[PDB]
Ligand binder design. Structure first.
Ligand code: ZN
Lengths: 1084, 185, 49
């Protein structure tokens, strides 16, 4: 058995499976073991086939630590129009064996870079968001028609108004596919004559020699004369394999190494940032046991043993600011839905019953009043009336513990005493029944979280005394006989209540005494400490981050107090209410028609009711705030309190709202849903009957020891905690808020300025219905990436998601407000999307987007110049002399009797169908099928050359043999016929194939050319020959393989925004993630 | 959603008629209510009261807050049923009156029972209670609160009437619902 | 705007939305007007949702 955490395990040959969790080298989420009983509790994930008496966690936790054993690259090099050559030396001969020549690059006539992220990867739990691009012969247009042109005129194209949103969302997916951690793996030293003595890494798989040529380019020697064999001969030899390693090990495997392999500088930068975010997050079990000691209010200690290790990574510490943002989102989740808060309050109402020592047994009242009977002659009797009204046979006390649970949640929900617990239609103190109804009401009123409960308590008796004693009012329309149920708001508190001196005792003595008792002995609010600072954060706002304010004065908890303690506030309250009731009955000034004299029986059944034995007012001040403060950090929706006052309509809260826009902007006032309530939150009704009988009857067990009872009740509910998952959820919630407020502001107009990288891609100023579906499409991508089936980021979508910063405020009655604006820390996914947008600004080519514009015009030549890099003869712009710029109002008049048809430019002049023009693309999209009728016969044969300015466009290539005839009209006209008003197909280019030997010259017809340089995607042409004679010439890009070919370069250095580098320096890790263990030791 | 059509709608029969394509509506989610009994109940309702009170009461009634009546024998058979085989006496009862009911062979000679029975009211135990003097407005307004309503008389309008005692003592929604009375609530 | 057949009201309801191909009189009128006077230009958003 274990001698570290004293765990009893039966077989002595799987003890390593337990002591690996203590950090000792020889599945579960957390593992606690008690100190006084043989009963460990194990908490396991929610997708199981069975359980070994194991509990679950119903928390939608994200997957933060995911591992990657393969290559950390996302770009790949594909062959396209392959070829073979005759060669010199074919293999390496050692003695008799022959080893074939493997190459790091595909031997083809043309080869160019495409993007297939995670193409050499061995992860577990893929993020389910890939960016897969076909080679540019195939159609790459299904990426850009992804969301927003769901309705489209033509399914064979893409909307040019949505290019920015689609490119930006696939930059988001390109980031979200690279949230992994690199995994250390085994190595293999070789002795080949080009990689002598290096320690190459072997990928996890059956074969190892297969990946070595792809990863390590210098291992292939220089057998013959080639472009690849020229590049490798230009490279250096020392930097290959592992650079260095860690000092600490476990046996022979070191903890972290770094290697020199084919990778992406952008991908290793993203994974370095994601590494640092998790490294800024962990915690040690010393702080775990500190937090679980402090949270338990000293009724139980806790200890968690562990061995010293740097391998530990348990990401749980988050900042204080992110809990507040997650709290605001969880408040906005409600939206005046009564459904989404009923299993929040009913559930805690059950849990408090299961923890509480208090046993509400209503037979104490029946035992005190069974001896009180009445004579056989007379009719009406107070002792039978109170028992027929209280009804102690009914044993459902849920209205008591829902009220106890509602103290944590004013502002989202407020509890009131229900209608039909007041006196029926007035109340009229002559009546017998309404006096007991007033008693049961006024004893249960101080426990609701209602700010107008004292005014309700006063106006109930003011209604009942109508006709016997009068009080002044203000405006002759709110008479004394206005029902006390209507006094629900702070603007209904009368002048006679707020100033006692207006109530004259010569007219209303009992109203004067009843106002004075409320102004003296109504219970005072207080606050109590809870939770942990410096671990777990603090998810409250408008309060100090550690106090829990509740409307009752609490006391330090002992047991042996006197039952009839009038220092106790609620016992003082019961005594004062009974004393005023027996002041009311005493004189019979108010009850004519009583034919008997009920003053003796009434005063007796009030005296037997005042000094009743009842441990509920002792409990609610000594042990109930302790039980609230213990379970308050463990809740899934942590408490959200708005400050308690009494008898003061200057700090009474009236209204809670969530501001979505910024501070220095004036927009439409979009008040939230929660501001449209009469009281401060959702109104909740309670029965005063079962609150009152629960106050009147309550006892403890006759062997109650607190250090046993609470140390036994705290343990199984801390053994099923989920606070450690709810901390991890809030990083993702705050990051999703920041990702929305950056990425929506990229496409809409607002006042959130962040750096605005990509603008040349065209779009439209998106309105609310467009930005909302874009933001929903961000949401459903992030939940897919992090395995989140619960709600996340969804309350920020009903309405206007063009937002800047979350805030929440309430106002008090006199007009002043309190504004809490939770500041933000750094966000990782947002500025990594900003970084890859900066990279995309220079490497637009590699994702298949072309920048600039095209020129539709016939070129009849036999030259070989590849129309993505045109010569400056064929291009023209607004600086070129004699170029007509066409605005929107281009109108075509036909020629009459042999005249040429003409069109109007921007300056009003009519020009013939001839020369050099500049359209914007919007003109052709407006007047397709019309411009398509007249312009084609002039473009195909005449001298019309049109420049369609568009900024961004997808492209696909069509390679042709440059020694045969080629006409581009069947591609160009097919592109022109398909431009519908809501979409455009990808621009077809007809670029030639380079060759090794010199070829025959054939005429070529081309119509569509580009404007600027447009192939940084092209990797190499004829990468097996000595040289490329005819065609486009492109050697191996030496600037992407920087650190080999550059002698005075440190290995760390990259150029990040200008051009991404291959063959980087990646550091690989191998961590542990032990489950949270704790030995829970009781306290004497 | 609740719409109202100018025809008697029963759930089991007007689906067989169709009854909604008959007005010209092409059409699951359309659940029919049984407003068969309310028309005969209205015809029995109109002969005692006036018209306007009955109609203006029935107008203010939603047909989604599902509820029911309860009809009890008046006073003598009410106490006699509690005297009988079930001791199903509610907890609202008088402590002395249930004690006199739990005994055997009560009669006119018992002064101690009769003195309390002649001052006992049904409105003490059951609330809210429809008596014969109540307006038809307050019947439906009290009916829209608490899912069961105690009465004294047959002549009520609204939901279905169910009885409290044996006769020896007496003298499921969907999205779209149709009915035959326009609600205002 | 609702109705049984509503995809032909938009040409009637917005004259300035039409493209301008010709020197027909309709296209001489439409292209001689101000563009930013179409559809919505003012709302009062008092509550979220
Ligand atoms: Zn152990």
């Amino acid at each position: 058995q274990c001698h570290v955490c004293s765990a009893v395990l039966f077989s002595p040959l799987d003890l390593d499976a337990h002591v690996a969790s203590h950090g000792l080298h020889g599945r579960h989420i957390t593992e606690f073991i008690s100190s006084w009983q043989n009963h460990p509790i194990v908490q396991v994930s929610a997708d199981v086939e069975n359980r070994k008496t194991a509990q679950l966690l119903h928390a939608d936790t994200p997957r933060l630590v995911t591992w990657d054993a393969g290559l950390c690259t996302s770009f790949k090099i594909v062959p396209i129009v392959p070829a073979q050559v005759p060669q010199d030396v074919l293999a390496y001969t050692f003695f008799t064996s022959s080893y074939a020549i493997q190459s790091p690059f595909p031997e083809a006539a043309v080869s160019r870079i495409v993007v297939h992220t995670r193409w050499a990867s061995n992860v577990d739990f893929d993020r389910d968001s890939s960016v897969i691009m076909a080679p540019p012969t195939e159609n790459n247009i299904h990426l850009f028609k992804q969301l927003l042109n769901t309705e489209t005129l033509s399914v064979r194209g893409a909307n040019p108004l949505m290019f920015r949103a689609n490119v930006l969302h696939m930059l988001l997916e390109f980031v979200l596919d690279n949230l992994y951690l690199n995994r250390h793996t085994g190595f293999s030293q070789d002795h080949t004559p080009f990689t002598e003595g290096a320690n190459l890494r072997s990928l996890p798989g059956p074969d190892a020699e297969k990946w070595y040529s792809i990863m390590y380019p210098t291992r292939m020697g220089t057998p013959n004369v080639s472009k690849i064999c020229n590049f490798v001969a230009s490279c250096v030899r020392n930097r290959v394999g592992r650079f260095d390693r860690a000092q600490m090990m476990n046996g022979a495997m070191s903890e972290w190494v770094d290697v020199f392999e084919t990778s992406d500088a952008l991908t290793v930068s993203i994974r370095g940032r994601w590494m640092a975010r998790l490294a800024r997050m962990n915690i040690n079990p010393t702080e775990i046991e500190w937090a679980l000691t402090e949270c338990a209010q000293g009724y139980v200690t806790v200890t968690s043993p562990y061995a010293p290790s740097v391998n530990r990574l348990m990401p749980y510490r988050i900042s204080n600011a992110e809990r507040q943002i997650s709290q605001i989102i969880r408040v906005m989740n409600i939206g005046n839905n009564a459904t989404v808060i009923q299993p929040v309050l009913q559930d805690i109402s059950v849990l408090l019953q299961r923890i509480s020592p208090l046993q509400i047994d209503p037979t104490i009242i029946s035992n005190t009043m069974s001896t009180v009977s009445e004579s056989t002659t007379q009719t009406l009797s107070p002792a039978s009336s109170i028992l027929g009204k209280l009804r102690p046979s009914n044993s459902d006390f849920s209205s008591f513990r829902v009220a106890l649970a509602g103290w944590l949640y004013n502002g989202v929900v407020t509890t009131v005493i229900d209608d039909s617990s007041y006196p029926k239609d007035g109340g009229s103190v002559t009546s017998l029944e309404n006096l007991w109804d007033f008693f049961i009401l006024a004893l249960a009123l101080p426990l609701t979280t209602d700010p107008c409960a004292p005014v309700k308590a006063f106006m109930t008796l003011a209604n009942m005394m109508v006709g016997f004693e009068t009080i002044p009012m203000d405006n002759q329309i709110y008479t004394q006989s206005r029902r006390a149920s209507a006094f629900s708001t702070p603007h209904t508190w009368p002048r006679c209540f707020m100033n006692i001196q207006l109530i004259s005792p010569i007219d209303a003595p009992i109203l004067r005494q009843w106002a004075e008792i409320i102004h003296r002995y109504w219970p005072n609010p207080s606050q109590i400490r809870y939770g942990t600072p410096n671990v777990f954060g603090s998810a409250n706002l408008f309060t100090p981050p550690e106090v829990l304010l509740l409307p009752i004065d609490h006391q330090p908890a002992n047991v042996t107090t006197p039952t009839l303690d009038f220092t106790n506030e609620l016992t003082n309250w019961r005594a004062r209410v009974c004393e005023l009731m027996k002041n009311l009955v005493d004189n019979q000034r108010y009850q004519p028609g009583w034919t008997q004299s009920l003053v003796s029986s009434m005063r007796g059944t009030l005296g037997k009711l005042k000094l009743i034995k009842s441990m509920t007012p002792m409990y609610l001040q000594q042990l109930a705030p302790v039980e609230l403060a213990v379970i308050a950090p463990m809740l899934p929706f942590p408490p959200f309190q708005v400050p308690y006052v009494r008898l003061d309509r200057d700090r009474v809260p009236t209204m809670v709202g969530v501001t979505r826009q910024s501070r220095d902007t004036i927009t439409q006032p979009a008040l939230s849903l929660s501001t449209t309530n009469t009281t401060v939150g959702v109104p909740l009704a309670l029965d005063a009957r079962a609150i009152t009988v629960a106050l009147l009857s309550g006892k403890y067990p006759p062997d109650l020891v607190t250090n046993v009872w609470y140390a036994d009740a705290i343990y199984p509910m801390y053994a099923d905690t989920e606070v450690f998952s709810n901390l991890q959820r809030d990083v993702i919630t705050c990051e999703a808020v920041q990702t929305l407020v950056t990425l929506v502001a990229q496409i809409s107009e607002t006042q959130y300025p962040v750096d605005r990288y990509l603008d040349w891609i065209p779009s439209l100023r998106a309105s609310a219905a467009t930005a909302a579906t874009f933001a929903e499409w961000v949401n459903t991508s992030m939940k897919t990436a992090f395995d989140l089936s619960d709600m996340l980021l969804e309350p920020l979508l009903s309405g206007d998601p063009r937002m800047t910063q979350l805030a929440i405020q309430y106002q008090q009655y006199n007009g002043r407000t309190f504004n809490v604006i939770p500041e933000m820390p750094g966000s990782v996914i947002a500025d990594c999307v900003q970084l890859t947008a900066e990279v995309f600004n220079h490497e637009y080519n590699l994702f298949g987007i072309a920048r600039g514009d095209i020129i539709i015009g016939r070129v009849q030549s036999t030259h070989l110049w590849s129309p993505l890099a045109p010569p400056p003869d064929l291009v023209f712009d607004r600086d070129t002399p004699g170029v007509h710029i066409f605005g929107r109002d281009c109108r075509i008049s036909f020629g009459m009797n042999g005249a040429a048809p003409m069109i109007r430019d921007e300056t009003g002049m009519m020009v013939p169908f001839e020369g050099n023009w500049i359209f914007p693309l919007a003109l052709w999209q407006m007047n397709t099928r019309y411009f398509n009728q007249q312009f084609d016969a002039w473009i195909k044969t005449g001298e019309l050359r049109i420049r369609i300015e568009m900024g961004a466009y997808p492209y696909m290539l069509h390679y042709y043999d440059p020694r045969q005839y080629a006409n581009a009209w069947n591609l160009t006209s097919a592109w022109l016929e398909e431009i519908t008003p809501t979409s455009i197909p990808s621009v077809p280019f007809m670029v030639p194939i380079s060759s090794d030997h010199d070829i025959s010259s054939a005429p070529a017809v081309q119509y569509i050319i580009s404007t600027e340089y447009n192939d940084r995607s092209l990797f190499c042409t004829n990468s097996s020959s000595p040289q490329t004679i005819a065609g486009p010439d492109k050697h191996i890009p030496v600037e992407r393989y920087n650190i080999l070919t550059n002698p005075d370069a440190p290995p760390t250095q990259i150029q990040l925004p200008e051009v991404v580098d291959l063959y980087n320096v990646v550091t690989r890790y191998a961590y542990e993630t032990p489950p949270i263990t704790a030995v829970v030791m009781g306290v004497p | 959603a609740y719409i109202a059509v100018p025809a008697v709608v029963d759930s089991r029969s007007s689906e067989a008629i169709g009854l909604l394509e008959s007005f010209g509506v092409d059409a699951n989610d359309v659940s029919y209510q049984d407003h068969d009994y309310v028309v005969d109940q209205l015809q029995y309702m109109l002969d005692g009261y006036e018209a306007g009170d009955v109609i203006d009461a029935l107008v203010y009634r939603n047909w989604l807050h599902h509820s029911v009546y309860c009809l009890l024998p008046p006073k003598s058979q009410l106490l006699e049923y509690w005297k009988s085989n079930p001791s199903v006496i509610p907890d609202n009862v008088d402590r002395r009156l249930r004690k006199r009911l739990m005994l055997k062979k009560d009669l006119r000679k018992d002064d101690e029972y009769n003195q309390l029975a002649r001052a006992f009211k049904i409105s003490d135990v059951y609330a809210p209670l429809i008596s014969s003097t109540t307006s038809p407005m307050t019947m439906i307004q009290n009916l829209n609160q608490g899912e069961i309503v105690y009465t004294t008389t047959d002549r009520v309008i609204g939901a279905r009437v169910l009885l409290y005692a044996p006769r020896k003592y007496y003298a499921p929604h969907s999205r779209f619902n149709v009915g035959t009375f326009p609600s205002i609530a």
